[PDB]
Amino acid sequence: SDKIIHLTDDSFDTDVLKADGAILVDFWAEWCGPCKMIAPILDEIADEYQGKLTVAKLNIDQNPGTAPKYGIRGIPTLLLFKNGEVAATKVGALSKGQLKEFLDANA
Ligand SMILES: [Cu+2]
């Protein structure tokens, strides 16, 4: 879990919107079962895609401001950013194989 960026409402603009590379943002909360199910999957993606993709997490309980800006209505929601713009989104939990397909669909 060492390579995942810990986002806040204040750092979101700098860490995501002003970044150039691709960033996969996980909107999550501790009370969300499916969010905890995909947490180890995100760790593997962060390791596997090192140097090509940054994985980041935004806790919506601690950071209530960001999710509404992207019309997020439920968690977990994965937002894939490229050049500060949403390239794709995925609502709900998914397997590692499905998340790899999701990323390759955007490559
Ligand atoms: Cu936090």
Numbering used by the authors: 1 to 107
Q: Which sentences did the original study use to describe this structure?
A:
Thioredoxins (TRX) are small globular proteins of about 100–110 residues, which are conserved in all living organisms. They participate in multiple critical redox-reactions via the reversible oxidation of the active site CXXC catalytic motif1. Two TRX forms were described in Escherichia coli, Trx1 and Trx22. The former, called EcTRX throughout this work, is a widely used experimental model for investigating the molecular basis of protein stability, folding and function.
